[PDB]
Amino acid sequence: TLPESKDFSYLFSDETNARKPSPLKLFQDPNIIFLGGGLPLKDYFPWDNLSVDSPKPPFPQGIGAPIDEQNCIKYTVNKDYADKSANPSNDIPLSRALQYGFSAGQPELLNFIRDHTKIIHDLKYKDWDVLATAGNTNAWESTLRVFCNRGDVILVEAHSFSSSLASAEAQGVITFPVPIDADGIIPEKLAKVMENWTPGAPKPKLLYTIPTGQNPTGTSIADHRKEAIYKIAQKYDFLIVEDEPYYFLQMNPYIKDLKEREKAQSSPKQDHDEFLKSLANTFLSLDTEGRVIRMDSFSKVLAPGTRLGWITGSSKILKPYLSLHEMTIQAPAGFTQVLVNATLSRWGQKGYLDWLLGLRHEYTLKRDCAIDALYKYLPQSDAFVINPPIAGMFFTVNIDASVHPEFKTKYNSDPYQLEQSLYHKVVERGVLVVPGSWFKSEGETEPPQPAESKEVSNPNIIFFRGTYAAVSPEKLTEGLKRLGDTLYEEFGIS
Amino acid sequence: TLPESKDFSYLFSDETNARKPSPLKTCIHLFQDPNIIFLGGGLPLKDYFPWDNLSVDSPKPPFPQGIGAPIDEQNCIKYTVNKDYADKSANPSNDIPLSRALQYGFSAGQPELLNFIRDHTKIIHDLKYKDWDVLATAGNTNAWESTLRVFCNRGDVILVEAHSFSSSLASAEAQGVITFPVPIDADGIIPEKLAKVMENWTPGAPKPKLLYTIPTGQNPTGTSIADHRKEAIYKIAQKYDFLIVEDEPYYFLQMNPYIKDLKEREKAQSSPKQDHDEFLKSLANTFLSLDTEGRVIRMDSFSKVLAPGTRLGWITGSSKILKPYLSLHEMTIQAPAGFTQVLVNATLSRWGQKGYLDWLLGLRHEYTLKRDCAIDALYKYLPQSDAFVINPPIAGMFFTVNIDASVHPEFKTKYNSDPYQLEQSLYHKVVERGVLVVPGSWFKSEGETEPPQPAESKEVSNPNIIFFRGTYAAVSPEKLTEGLKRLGDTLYEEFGI
Numbered sequence: 001t002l003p004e005s006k007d008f009s010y011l012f013s014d015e016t017n018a019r020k021p022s023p024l025k026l027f028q029d030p031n032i033i034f035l036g037g038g039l040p041l042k043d044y045f046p047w048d049n050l051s052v053d054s055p056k057p058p059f060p061q062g063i064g065a066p067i068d069e070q071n072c073i074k075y076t077v078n079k080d081y082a083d084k085s086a087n088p089s090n091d092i093p094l095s096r097a098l099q100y101g102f103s104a105g106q107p108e109l110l111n112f113i114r115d116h117t118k119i120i121h122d123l124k125y126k127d128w129d130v131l132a133t134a135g136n137t138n139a140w141e142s143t144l145r146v147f148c149n150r151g152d153v154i155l156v157e158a159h160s161f162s163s164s165l166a167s168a169e170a171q172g173v174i175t176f177p178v179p180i181d182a183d184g185i186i187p188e189k190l191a192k193v194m195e196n197w198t199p200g201a202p203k204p205k206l207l208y209t210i211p212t213g214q215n216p217t218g219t220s221i222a223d224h225r226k227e228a229i230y231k232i233a234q235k236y237d238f239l240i241v242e243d244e245p246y247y248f249l250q251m252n253p254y255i256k257d258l259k260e261r262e263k264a265q266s267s268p269k270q271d272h273d274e275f276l277k278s279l280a281n282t283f284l285s286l287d288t289e290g291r292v293i294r295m296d297s298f299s300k301v302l303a304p305g306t307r308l309g310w311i312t313g314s315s316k317i318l319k320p321y322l323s324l325h326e327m328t329i330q331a332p333a334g335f336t337q338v339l340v341n342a343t344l345s346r347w348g349q350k351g352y353l354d355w356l357l358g359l360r361h362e363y364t365l366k367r368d369c370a371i372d373a374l375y376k377y378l379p380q381s382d383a384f385v386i387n388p389p390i391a392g393m394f395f396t397v398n399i400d401a402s403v404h405p406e407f408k409t410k411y412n413s414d415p416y417q418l419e420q421s422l423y424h425k426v427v428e429r430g431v432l433v434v435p436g437s438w439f440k441s442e443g444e445t446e447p448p449q450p451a452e453s454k455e456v457s458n459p460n461i462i463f464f465r466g467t468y469a470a471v472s473p474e475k476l477t478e479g480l481k482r483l484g485d486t487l488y489e490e491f492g493i494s
Numbered sequence: 495t496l497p498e499s500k501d502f503s504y505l506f507s508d509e510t511n512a513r514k515p516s517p518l519k520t521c522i523h524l525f526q527d528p529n530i531i532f533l534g535g536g537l538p539l540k541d542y543f544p545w546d547n548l549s550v551d552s553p554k555p556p557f558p559q560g561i562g563a564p565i566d567e568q569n570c571i572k573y574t575v576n577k578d579y580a581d582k583s584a585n586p587s588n589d590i591p592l593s594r595a596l597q598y599g600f601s602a603g604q605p606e607l608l609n610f611i612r613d614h615t616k617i618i619h620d621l622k623y624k625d626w627d628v629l630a631t632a633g634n635t636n637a638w639e640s641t642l643r644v645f646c647n648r649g650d651v652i653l654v655e656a657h658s659f660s661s662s663l664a665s666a667e668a669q670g671v672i673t674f675p676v677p678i679d680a681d682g683i684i685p686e687k688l689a690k691v692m693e694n695w696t697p698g699a700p701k702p703k704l705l706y707t708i709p710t711g712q713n714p715t716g717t718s719i720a721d722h723r724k725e726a727i728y729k730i731a732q733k734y735d736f737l738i739v740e741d742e743p744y745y746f747l748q749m750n751p752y753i754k755d756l757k758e759r760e761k762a763q764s765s766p767k768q769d770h771d772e773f774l775k776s777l778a779n780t781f782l783s784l785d786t787e788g789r790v791i792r793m794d795s796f797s798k799v800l801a802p803g804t805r806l807g808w809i810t811g812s813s814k815i816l817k818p819y820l821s822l823h824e825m826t827i828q829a830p831a832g833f834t835q836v837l838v839n840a841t842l843s844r845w846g847q848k849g850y851l852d853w854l855l856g857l858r859h860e861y862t863l864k865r866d867c868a869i870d871a872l873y874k875y876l877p878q879s880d881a882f883v884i885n886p887p888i889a890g891m892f893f894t895v896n897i898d899a900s901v902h903p904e905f906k907t908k909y910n911s912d913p914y915q916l917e918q919s920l921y922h923k924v925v926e927r928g929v930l931v932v933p934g935s936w937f938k939s940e941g942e943t944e945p946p947q948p949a950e951s952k953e954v955s956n957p958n959i960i961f962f963r964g965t966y967a968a969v970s971p972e973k974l975t976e977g978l979k980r981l982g983d984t985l986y987e988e989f990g991i
């Protein structure tokens with residue numbers, strides 16, 4: 001009924017095309033005596049009866065409540081189970097989690113992830129699958145190895161995640177920046193970059209985007225924009241790699257008027273159907289061809305130290321990723337898979353939505369606190385633009401450098417020089433937010449792209465990224481007060 | 495005091511030289527700072543991490559019933575690791591709290607775990623330069639991947655054993671790294687032959703950046719490089735300026751030599767177990783212990799010691815050499831899974847360095863039994879002409895059956911005098927008998943330089959000898975013995991011997 005994915009192997013790197021798996025890869029087969037692979041006896045693995053406490057859906061006191069008493073699910077995973085009847089929650093037994101094998105991920109884990117995938121997204125082609133990773137850092141590294149030769153070109157957001165950019169730069173992959181605004185990638189500008197792409201220059205292989213709660217701008221690509229960008233990717237034949245660690249940091253609408261906000265907060269909470277309907281569309285759900293690779297992580301949902309995530313893409317696309325994983329990480333840590341699977345399986349798909357609803361709630365409160373402080377403590381004028389993010393853990397403080405009294409004299413109309421001195425001046429006041437320039441994508445092709453493709457809107461706008469994820473409301477508010485005080489003083493505003 | 499490592503940065507790959515870490519990395523150190531409010535990270539609240547009170551059972555030193563005994567009754571330690579500790583005194587065991595294991599940070603590995611590893615390092619090795627350190631990895635598979643990224647551009651050359659680990663070779667091949675084979679025998683790498691390869695290295699050809707070696711329980715040959723040979727090999731490395739990467743996942747699978755006479759063995763196995771001092775004295779010297787310059791990189795793994803799915807190992811090397819590996823890790827794999835580090839640290843710390851030696855002695859005992867069983871069966875079921883050679887391994891989990899393909903009746907005719915042809919025949923015939931072994935050619939290193947090396951450097955010692963690698967680690971004594979009966983019989987039948 002659904003079409004098969006397209007074959008994009010013509011985009012595979014030289015390393016991918018050269019990679020041949022070790023022929024040294026039946027152990028469970030009753031009739032074969034296994035004298036081949038060095039699989040050590042599970043009798044020697046020095047752990048049994050792994051137990052833990054996890055909070056209990058629907059997390060009535062908030063997802064941050066102490067884990068005990070009635071807010072507590074308790075369980076134990078054994079090394080071996082006598083019969084399938086002794087394993088009702090379908091845990092990954094330690095004997096299997098701790099033995100070589102299952103480089104794509106343990107099947108119980110991937111089954112939970114596939115079921116979750118079907119709830120969250122609407123898949124438009126037949127042969128999609130998932131592959132477990134050690135997180136989105138790992139997934140992006142693998143994506144570069146799989147597709148990009150030194151000197152290949154990718155498209156990136158004009159400001160993007162510092163590590164992803166650094167990773168591509170180390171490999172000599174050209175990161176060509178495309179324009180973004182308050183609603184993320186601007187499709188018309190993207191289209192123009194492609195239509196005017198200099199003949200002779202390497203064709204971009206893929207677009208690397210963080211569509212929801214963009215790092216660092218905090219923006220989200222509007223649904224209609226994702227549709228227009230997907231069409232551009234089809235017309236110019238590039239893949240879309242969506243890095244989505246913040247997808248579930250989508251928030252309830254920012255409401256500036258406090259009385260209006262209290263009324264809205266007084267209303268019943270979202271049910272599961274309302275939650276799902278409120279979520280942003282995804283490039284995965286738009287993909288009819290298998291040209292989208294989505295990178296998901298448990299870092300911001302469960303914990304950064306889980307070191308576990310997954311990729312979703314076509315069965316065709318996932319082949320070289322699995323071959324690479326087999327020769328690099330091998331498989332995500334068995335214990336992390338056991339504990340993530342066990343907790344998620346007990347929550348169930350529905351209990352996991354309750355968890356994600358709790359996560360949404362906590363972030364909303366943090367965001368409101370941040371934005372309230374900015375409206376209260378920053379100078380209020382066209383020079384200081386505040387965009388309340390609708391998703392993510394980041395906000396930006398935007399500054400028109402050209403309004404500084406010494407921009408022309410002291411700073412030689414150089415916005416970067418002003419940014420750098422404000423950074424120090426802010427740290428001297430006792431708050432650290434991070435310079436926009438650290439996230440600025442830079443790339444050039446041979447032969448070069450035309451002038452129009454290099455344009456920057458508002459070249460005198462500088463910004464700082466802050467986050468509301470990590471600190472108390474009191475510390476957040478005080479930090480932003482200090483920052484705002486610095487800006488008044490520094491800008492000669494009364 | 496001790497000398498400082500040498501700077502080998504001239505060996506770093508182009509990718510390594512181009513990798514620049516973010517100024518953002520600096521900032522992530524200003525979290526707990528109380529004078530600067532830090533709104534510059536992306537560290538989610540530990541309040542939301544959905545686990546607390548991680549508990550498990552582990553076996554108990556000195557493991558008197560064997561390291562494979564059930565984890566229960568007396569052979570059982572129980573512990574519980576909390577997410578947070580009210581104060582350090584509510585944490586007497588010095589566990590990595592979950593709130594820290596599961597947060598971003600410590601990309602080199604959690605301090606408690608690295609401290610245990612450093613203490614262990616000092617017990618096992620005799621270190622001879624000042625700035626050695628350790629870095630946690632996701633295992634030797636990833637450590638080798640990382641080594642190739644750090645040092646080798648496409649077209650660079652490394653030296654490898656004539657027969658080596660199939661996966662290491664395939665990793666190098668995928669990256670276009672030339673793997674130039676050097677000769678080995680019953681005692682591992684032959685230093686005189688290695689020295690000649692370097693002496694005769696063709697001017698203008700890429701000079702080797704490193705030797706990749708599996709010195710103890712070599713995969714696949716099962717050999718151990720003699721103490722004096724390591725000393726010689728290290729000198730060659732100093733002379734021709736290459737690094738030594740010792741891939742050592744089988745180091746603690748060393749065994750007493752195989753005693754052929756059963757009476758001679760019963761009385762020797764009658765003597766009480768090694769104490770820790772005789773255990774340590776019995777261990778092979780390491781390239782790490784020879785290193786006075788930081789030219790050695792050791793790759794260690796908990797895979798064969800604790801379990802493969804731990805996905806945890808470490809690299810030992812100079813602070814200078816570890817710097818680009820950490821920079822690469824921060825952009826790739828990041829730190830090993832927090833839960834793996836918590837559970838490995840928690841179990842090892844409670845065993846202590848001494849209980850961990852008891853464990854490793856228990857591992858030696860189990861593999862010794864397995865080796866004896868295998869080698870005994872080979873002497874019972876294999877033909878005993880000069881055309882069938884068994885070298886009983888002193889280390890590791892593999893044995894080989896070396897066979898002169900030439901002595902086969904239908905060799906000239908059915909296989910047109912082609913050893914590889916015979917090897918693939920035998921291999922499928924054996925699997926058809928219900929026993930899985932591995933053809934030796936899957937391990938054969940191949941590489942060439944431009945301009946080519948001279949012919950002396952390319953010589954092979956009678957290409958009519960084929961081999962099969964078997965393992966005694968994975969199955970029961972009874973299955974191992976049956977497996978090797980079928981194999982020895984197949985050989986008897988096939989050679990009409």
Ligand SMILES: Cc1ncc(COP(=O)(O)O)c(CN)c1O
Pocket residue numbers: 038330632633634635636659708713741743794795796797802807
């Ligand atoms: C020489 C060698 N290196 C590495 C490994 C595996 O290392 P790890 O399981 O630590 O990734 C093996 C066996 N799988 C090996 O024999």
